[PDB]
Design a protein around this ligand. Structure first.
Ligand SMILES: *[C@@H]1O[C@H](CO)[C@@H](O[C@@H]2O[C@H](CO)[C@@H](O[C@@H]3O[C@H](CO[C@H]4O[C@H](CO)[C@@H](O)[C@H](O)[C@@H]4O)[C@@H](O)[C@H](O[C@H]4O[C@H](CO)[C@@H](O)[C@H](O)[C@@H]4O)[C@@H]3O)[C@H](O)[C@H]2NC(C)=O)[C@H](O)[C@H]1NC(C)=O
Ligand code: 83J
Ligand SMILES: *[C@@H]1O[C@H](CO)[C@@H](O[C@@H]2O[C@H](CO)[C@@H](O)[C@H](O)[C@H]2NC(C)=O)[C@H](O)[C@H]1NC(C)=O
Ligand SMILES: *[C@@H]1O[C@H](CO)[C@@H](O[C@@H]2O[C@H](CO)[C@@H](O)[C@H](O)[C@H]2NC(C)=O)[C@H](O)[C@H]1NC(C)=O
Ligand SMILES: *[C@@H]1O[C@H](CO)[C@@H](O[C@@H]2O[C@H](CO)[C@@H](O)[C@H](O)[C@H]2NC(C)=O)[C@H](O)[C@H]1NC(C)=O
Ligand SMILES: *[C@@H]1O[C@H](CO)[C@@H](O[C@@H]2O[C@H](CO)[C@@H](O)[C@H](O)[C@H]2NC(C)=O)[C@H](O)[C@H]1NC(C)=O
Ligand SMILES: *[C@@H]1O[C@H](CO)[C@@H](O[C@@H]2O[C@H](CO)[C@@H](O)[C@H](O)[C@H]2NC(C)=O)[C@H](O)[C@H]1NC(C)=O
Ligand SMILES: *[C@@H]1O[C@H](CO)[C@@H](O[C@@H]2O[C@H](CO)[C@@H](O)[C@H](O)[C@H]2NC(C)=O)[C@H](O)[C@H]1NC(C)=O
Ligand SMILES: *[C@@H]1O[C@H](CO)[C@@H](O[C@@H]2O[C@H](CO)[C@@H](O)[C@H](O)[C@H]2NC(C)=O)[C@H](O)[C@H]1NC(C)=O
Ligand SMILES: *[C@@H]1O[C@H](CO)[C@@H](O[C@@H]2O[C@H](CO)[C@@H](O)[C@H](O)[C@H]2NC(C)=O)[C@H](O)[C@H]1NC(C)=O
Ligand SMILES: *[C@@H]1O[C@H](CO)[C@@H](O[C@@H]2O[C@H](CO)[C@@H](O)[C@H](O)[C@H]2NC(C)=O)[C@H](O)[C@H]1NC(C)=O
Ligand code: NAG
Ligand code: NAG
Ligand code: NAG
Ligand code: NAG
Ligand code: NAG
Ligand code: NAG
Ligand code: NAG
Ligand code: NAG
Ligand code: NAG
Ligand code: NAG
Ligand code: NAG
Ligand code: NAG
Lengths: 451, 123, 123, 123, 48
C-alpha cells in the first residue's frame, strides 16, 4: 500500500527546444578539393549509414512556419558567404567612367547592346602612371551617365568585392546534425502539409542532404513529394503569403551560356588582379533555358488540380508572369556553374484553366554584379567563367503568389515570385522538428533502499 | 528498439530499455564555432544530471530506489494504472507540479542516511 | 542558510550543510568569448575533484570514512577542540602542510582494498 | 614507476600500478584557440569512458569484477599464460575482435541485476 | 622540472618522415607570422 520515490535515468520524454545544429558533409574533399563557399573541409564527416528509428504509438504536432531549424540555416548561409568574400579583392578602383561601345553595332540583330566593350583608365603597377585597359561588360551592369560614358551599376550605392576565383559555387549536400542529448523528429507522412498532427513520426540524428541552392520562382534540385503535388502556404487566404508547390516528378530544365568566353587579368593594384572578360571566340549567341513543352504542360495541370482543393472545385485558375520588383524576383534567377542567370519565365506562366519533341526556350541573361538579398549596401562581382556553360537540373517546385480581387471575382491569378531565401530552406526542412531529451524521472514503485 | 523507440509505450514497458537512452546522451570558422559550442553544451548538460543523480545517492545506476515515500497527494493513482496505462510523457506532465518538491526531498533524505551511516560506523 | 552561510561556524556545525555547497559548484564577441571560457573552466574544475574523490572510493558521497589513520603528527588536537572550536578555514590553514601526504595515502590505501576485495571475490 | 612505466611488463605486473595511469588522464589567438580545444577535447574524452564504466556498474573502481563469463571462444588461453606472459598491448591486439561483443554483454548483464535487485527490494 | 619516464622493455618504431608533429608546427608558424603582420602598416602608397 505504501510507495517510495524511485528515480529512473534514460526515460523517453522530450521537449521542443531550439539549439545550435552543426554539420555533417558526406562529400568531404574526395581527393578533388576546390574549396567552395560552404561545408567541404570544415563540416564534420557524416555517417556511412544513418540511423532512423520509427517512434511507434506517437503522434507529434508540426508547424512548418514556426520552425527554428530554418531561421538558423538562413543565417548560417549569409555568414558562409560573408566569410568567403572578406579575403579577396575589393573593386573600389573600378569607379572610373567607362567609354563603352556596343560589341556588335552594325554586326547582327537590331543593334542591341547586350554586350558593351568598355575601356577605362587604371593604375597598373605604379600609382602615378595609369594605362588604358578595357573589358567586356554586360548591359545589365553599366549605367549611362549624362560612345557615351558609362559606369558600374553598383558603385553609387554598394561596395563591390570580387569573388575569389578559386572557390567553387557548386552546392554540396549538407546534413544538419544535432548535439548529444537532442534529437530531430522526422514526419514520415507522405501527404504532409507542414502543420497539424503527424501520426507517423521518426527519430533521426540529422537531416538528409540539403543542397544550399538559392533560386527564385522555381525550386531547382530540391526534394520531390512522394505521392502528389503539395501546396503549402502560411495563410492560404492571404494574398501577401507565398505558396510553395512541390512536384512529385521533376521537370528537367537545360540551359547554357553558348558563348566561349575568355577571362583576362587586369592589375588594379600591387598584388591584386581584376578578372575581366577579354573577348568571345566564335559567334555571339544568347543564353537560354529549355523546358519540355509536354512535361511542363502535364505537371502544371497537376498543380491546378490541387489548387482547386483550396480555391473551390469549380473555379478558373490562370497563371500570369511576375508583376514587378528586382530582376531576381521578376525573373527565374539561379547560379549555373558560377554564372548567374535571370531567365524570362513568361512562356511558362501563360495559361488559363477551366473546370472541364517540342520545347520551351526561356531567354536568360547574365549578370556580373550581384547584390545581397534581404538588403545591405553590398555587392559581389562574379569573375567570368572561361568556357561554355552547360548545366541541367530538376524543377521540384514553385513559389507562387496570389493577387487581390478574389472577393467578387470567380477567377484566380497566380503570379510567380521569389526574393526571400528563407522560403528556400523551408521547402526542404519543413518536416523536421528538433526536440531535447529529458532523461530523469520519478515514480512510486514500492522499492525501498536498504539501510 | 532504438533511441526513443519506447516513447509511446506505457511506463512499465519503457523501463526495460533504459540503457538505450542512457548511453546516447553523451556520445574556428562559422562551422567550427557552432561545432565547438555543440560539444561544450553537451558535456555541461550531461554533467548537470550526473551531479543531481549523485546528491541523491544513485550515482552509477539507471534505477535507484529511495527512502522517501510518495505522499499520495502528488498522485493518488494505483500502482497498475501508473505503470501500465500512462506513458512517461503523460506521467511527467501530470507530476510536473511536484518535481521541485520531490527533488528537494531526495537530497535532504540522502544527507540524513549519510550522517546516520556515519554515526553508525563509529559503533 | 545559503551558499557559504556556515563559513564562520565551527567545523561541527558546518558539516550538516554540505549539500548546500556541493550542489552549487557546477550550476563569439568579447562577451561571448569570456562567457564560453567561464563554462569550460567550470566543468573541468568540477571534474578535478570528482576524479580525485573517485580514486579514494568516495564517488557519490559527501562524507566518506576511509581506512587510513590520523598519525597524530599531522595534528595532535582533541576530537572536541577540532570539531567545535576550529572553523574549516582554520583547520585547512593548520593542516595544509600534510594534505599532499594525506591525499597520497588516501589513494594508495584504496587500491589496496580494491585488490584485497578482488582476491577475496575468488574465495 | 611513472605514467606508462609498466607498459612492457606482463599483464599481471602492470595491474598493480593502475592508479598511476588513471590519475593522469584528466590533469583567442592561434595559441589560445589550440589551447582551448586541448581542454575541451580532454574532458569529453575522459567522460566517454566514465559513462561506459558506469553502465557496467564499475563507477568508482579501477578493477571491477563482472557477472559475465569468458565464453572461451574469445581466447582459449590459460589463466597463467595470460596474466604472466602477455603484456596489455598484446592482449588488446589479440582480443580486439570481441571487444564490441564483450562491451555489449557487460551492459545488458548489468541492467539485468539492476532489475533483479529492484525486484528483490520489494520482498 | 619536466618529468621523463623511461619505458623499459618497450621497443617502438619511428618514422621521421611521416611525422604529423612537424606538419602541425609548420602551420603554427605560418599563422603566427600572419597574426602579427595584420595589425600594422600596409605600404601600398610606396609604389611610386
Ligand atoms: C543541379 O544538380 C546537377 C547535378 O547535381 C548540377 O549539374 C552539375 O553542374 C555542374 C556545373 O555545370 C557540373 O560541374 C561542371 O561540370 C563540367 C562538365 O562535367 C565534366 O566533368 C565532371 C567532373 O570530371 C564529370 O563528372 C562530367 O561527367 C563531365 O565529364 C566541368 O567542365 C566543370 O569543370 C569546371 O569547374 C570545376 C569546378 O569549379 C573546375 O575544377 C574545373 O577546372 C572547371 O573549371 C564543372 O565541374 C557538374 O558536373 C554537374 N553534375 C551533373 C551530375 O550533371 C546542376 O548544376 C545543378 N543546378 C543548380 C542550379 O544547382
Ligand atoms: C551575392 O550576395 C552577397 C554579395 N556580397 C556579399 N558580401 C560582400 N562583402 C561581404 C563581406 N559580403 C554577401 N554576403 C552574403 C551574401 C549572401 O549570402 C546573399 O545575399 N546571397 C547569396 C545566395 N544568392 C544567390 O546565389 C543568387 C541566387 C539566385 C539569383 C541571384 C543570386 C542570393 C543572395 C552576399
Ligand atoms: C573592344 O575594343 C578594343 C579597343 O579598345 C578592341 O581592341 C582592338 O581590336 C582591334 C581589332 O582586333 C586591334 O586592331 C586593336 O589593336 C585592338 N586595340 C587594343 C587596344 O587592344 C577589341 O578588339 C574590342 N573587342 C570586341 C570584342 O569588340
Ligand atoms: C584616360 O586618360 C587619358 C589621359 O591620360 C584621357 O585622354 C585625354 O582626353 C582628354 C579629353 O579632353 C584630352 O584633352 C587629352 O589630350 C587626352 N590625353 C591623352 C590622349 O593622352 C582619356 O580620355 C581617359 N579615358 C577614360 C577616362 O576613359
Ligand atoms: C544610383 O544611380 C542609379 C542610376 O542613376 C539611381 O537609380 C535611378 O533612380 C532614379 C530616381 O527616380 C530613377 O528615375 C532611375 O530609373 C534609376 N535608375 C535605374 C537604372 O533604375 C539610384 O537612385 C542611385 N542611388 C542613390 C541615389 O542612392
Ligand atoms: C533529377 O531527377 C531524377 C529523377 O527523375 C534523378 O534521377 C534519380 O536519382 C535518384 C537518386 O538521386 C535515383 O534513385 C533514381 O533512380 C533516379 N531516376 C532516374 C530516372 O534517373 C536525378 O538525379 C535528378 N537530378 C538532379 C537532382 O540534379
Ligand atoms: C573555346 O576557345 C578556346 C580558345 O581560347 C579553345 O581552346 C582551343 O582549342 C583548340 C581545339 O579545341 C586548340 O587547337 C587550341 O590550342 C585551344 N586554345 C587554347 C588557348 O586553349 C576551346 O576549345 C574553345 N571551346 C569550345 C567548347 O569550343
Ligand atoms: C536535357 O539534356 C538531356 C541530356 O543532358 C537530354 O536527355 C536526352 O534526351 C534524349 C531525348 O530526345 C535522349 O535520346 C538522350 O538519350 C538523352 N540524353 C541523356 C544523357 O539522358 C534531354 O532531352 C534535354 N531536355 C531538354 C528539355 O532540353
Ligand atoms: C509579362 O507579360 C506581359 C504581357 O505578356 C508584359 O506586359 C507588358 O508590359 C509593358 C510594361 O513594361 C507594356 O509596355 C506592354 O504593353 C505589356 N504587354 C502586353 C502584351 O500587355 C510584361 O512586361 C511581362 N513582364 C514580365 C516580368 O515578364
Ligand atoms: C519576357 O518575355 C515576354 C514575352 O515573351 C516579353 O513581353 C513583351 O513585352 C513587350 C513590352 O513589355 C511587348 O511589346 C511584347 O509584345 C511582349 N511580348 C509578348 C510575346 O507578349 C517581355 O518583354 C520579356 N522581358 C521581360 C523583362 O518581361
Ligand atoms: C501566351 O499564349 C498566347 C496563346 O497561347 C499568345 O498569344 C499570341 O498573341 C499574339 C497576338 O499578336 C499572336 O500573334 C500569337 O500568334 C499568339 N500566340 C499563339 C501561340 O497563337 C501570347 O503571345 C503568349 N504570351 C506570352 C508572353 O508568351
Ligand atoms: C501502439 O498502440 C497499439 C494499439 O493496440 C499497440 O498494440 C502497440 O503495442 C502500441 N505500441 C507499442 C510499441 O507497444
Ligand atoms: C548601342 O546600342 C543602343 C541600342 O539602342 C544605342 O542606344 C546606343 O547608342 C549604341 N551605342 C553605340 C556606341 O553605338
Ligand atoms: C496542355 O496544354 C493545353 C494548352 O496549352 C491545355 O489546354 C491542356 O489542358 C494541357 N494538357 C494537360 C494534360 O495538362
Ligand atoms: C470537389 O467539389 C465538391 C463539391 O461537391 C467539393 O465539396 C470538394 O471540396 C471539391 N474538391 C474535392 C472533392 O477534392
Ligand atoms: C505530504 O504532502 C503534503 C502536501 O503539501 C504536505 O503538507 C505534507 O507535509 C507531506 N508529508 C506528509 C507526511 O504528508
Ligand atoms: C487498483 O487496483 C485494485 C487491485 O485489484 C483494483 O481493485 C482497483 O479497481 C484499482 N483501481 C483502479 C482505479 O483501477
Ligand atoms: C558568531 O558568534 C555569535 C556569538 O556567539 C554566534 O551566535 C554565531 O553563531 C557565530 N557564527 C555563526 C556562523 O554561528
Ligand atoms: C606517521 O607520520 C610520521 C611523520 O613523518 C612518519 O614518519 C610515519 O611513517 C607515519 N606513519 C606512522 C605509522 O607513524
Ligand atoms: C580532550 O578531551 C578530554 C575529555 O574529557 C579532556 O579531559 C581534555 O581536557 C581535552 N583536551 C583539551 C586540550 O581540551
Ligand atoms: C559464446 O560465444 C559463441 C561464439 O559466437 C556464441 O555463439 C555463444 O552464444 C556464446 N555464448 C555461449 C554460452 O557459448
Ligand atoms: C595451464 O596450466 C596448467 C596448470 O598446471 C598446466 O598444466 C598447463 O600446462 C598450462 N597450459 C599451458 C598452455 O601453459
Ligand atoms: C624486460 O626484460 C628484462 C629482462 O628479463 C626484465 O628484467 C624486465 O622486467 C622486463 N621489463 C619490465 C618492464 O619489467
Amino acid at each position: 500500500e505504501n510507495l517510495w520515490v524511485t528515480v529512473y535515468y534514460g526515460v523517453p520524454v522530450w521537449k521542443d527546444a531550439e539549439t545550435t545544429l552543426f554539420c555533417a558533409s558526406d562529400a568531404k574533399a574526395y581527393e578533388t578539393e576546390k574549396h567552395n563557399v560552404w561545408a567541404t573541409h570544415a563540416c564534420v564527416p557524416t555517417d556511412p549509414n544513418p540511423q532512423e528509428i520509427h517512434l511507434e504509438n506517437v503522434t507529434e504536432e508540426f508547424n512548418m512556419w514556426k520552425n527554428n531549424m530554418v531561421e538558423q540555416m538562413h543565417t548560417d548561409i549569409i555568414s558562409l558567404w560573408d566569410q568567403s568574400l572578406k579575403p579577396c579583392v575589393k573593386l573600389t578602383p573600378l569607379c572610373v567612367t567607362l567609354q563603352c561601345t556596343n560589341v556588335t553595332n552594325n554586326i547582327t540583330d537590331d543593334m542591341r547592346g547586350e554586350l558593351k566593350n568598355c575601356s577605362f583608365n587604371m593604375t597598373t603597377e605604379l600609382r602615378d602612371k595609369k594605362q588604358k585597359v578595357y573589358s567586356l561588360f554586360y548591359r545589365l551592369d553599366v549605367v549611362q551617365i549624362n560612345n557615351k560614358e558609362y559606369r558600374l551599376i553598383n558603385c553609387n550605392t554598394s561596395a563591390i568585392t570580387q569573388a575569389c576565383p578559386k572557390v567553387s559555387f557548386e552546392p554540396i549536400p549538407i546534413h544538419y546534425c544535432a548535439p548529444a542529448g537532442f534529437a530531430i523528429l522526422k514526419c514520415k507522412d507522405k501527404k504532409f502539409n507542414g502543420t497539424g498532427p503527424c501520426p507517423s513520426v521518426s527519430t533521426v540524428q540529422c537531416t538528409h542532404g540539403i543542397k544550399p541552392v538559392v533560386s527564385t520562382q522555381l525550386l531547382l534540385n530540391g526534394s520531390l513529394a512522394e505521392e502528389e503535388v503539395m501546396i503549402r502556404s502560411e495563410n492560404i487566404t492571404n494574398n501577401a503569403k507565398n505558396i510553395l508547390v512541390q512536384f512529385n516528378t521533376p521537370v528537367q530544365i537545360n540551359c547554357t551560356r553558348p558563348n566561349n568566353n575568355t577571362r583576362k587579368s587586369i592589375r588594379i593594384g600591387p598584388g591584386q588582379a581584376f578578372y575581366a572578360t577579354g573577348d568571345i571566340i566564335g559567334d555571339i549567341r544568347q543564353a537560354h533555358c529549355n523546358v519540355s513543352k509536354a512535361t511542363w504542360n502535364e505537371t502544371l495541370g497537376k498543380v491546378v488540380k490541387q489548387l482547386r482543393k483550396h480555391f473551390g472545385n469549380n473555379t478558373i485558375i490562370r497563371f500570369a508572369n511576375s508583376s514587378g520588383g528586382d530582376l531576381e524576383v521578376t525573373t527565374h534567377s539561379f547560379n549555373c556553374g558560377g554564372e548567374f542567370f535571370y531567365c524570362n519565365t513568361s512562356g511558362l506562366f501563360n495559361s488559363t484553366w477551366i473546370s472541364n519533341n517540342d520545347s520551351i526556350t526561356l531567354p536568360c541573361r547574365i549578370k556580373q554584379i550581384i547584390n545581397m538579398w534581404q538588403r545591405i549596401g553590398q555587392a559581389m562581382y562574379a569573375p567570368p567563367i572561361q568556357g561554355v556553360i552547360r548545366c541541367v537540373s530538376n524543377i521540384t517546385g514553385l513559389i507562387l503568389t496570389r493577387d487581390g480581387g478574389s472577393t467578387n471575382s470567380t477567377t484566380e491569378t497566380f503570379r510567380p515570385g521569389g526574393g526571400d531565401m528563407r522560403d528556400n530552406w523551408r521547402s526542404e526542412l519543413y518536416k523536421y522538428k528538433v526536440v531535447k531529451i529529458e532523461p530523469l524521472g520519478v515514480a512510486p514503485t514500492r522499492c525501498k533502499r536498504r539501510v | 528498439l532504438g533511441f526513443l523507440g519506447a516513447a509511446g509505450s506505457t511506463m512499465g514497458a519503457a523501463s526495460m530499455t533504459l540503457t538505450v537512452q542512457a548511453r546516447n546522451l553523451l556520445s574556428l570558422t562559422v562551422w567550427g564555432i557552432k561545432q565547438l559550442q555543440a560539444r561544450v553544451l553537451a558535456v555541461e548538460r550531461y554533467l548537470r544530471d550526473q551531479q543531481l543523480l549523485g546528491i541523491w545517492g544513485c550515482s552509477g545506476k539507471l534505477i535507484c530506489c529511495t527512502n522517501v515515500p510518495w505522499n499520495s497527494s502528488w498522485s493518488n493513482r494505483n500502482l497498475s494504472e501508473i505503470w501500465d496505462n500512462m506513458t512517461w510523457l503523460q506521467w511527467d506532465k501530470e507530476i510536473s507540479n511536484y518535481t521541485q518538491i520531490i527533488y528537494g526531498l531526495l537530497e535532504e533524505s540522502q544527507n540524513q542516511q549519510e550522517k546516520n551511516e556515519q554515526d553508525l560506523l563509529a559503533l
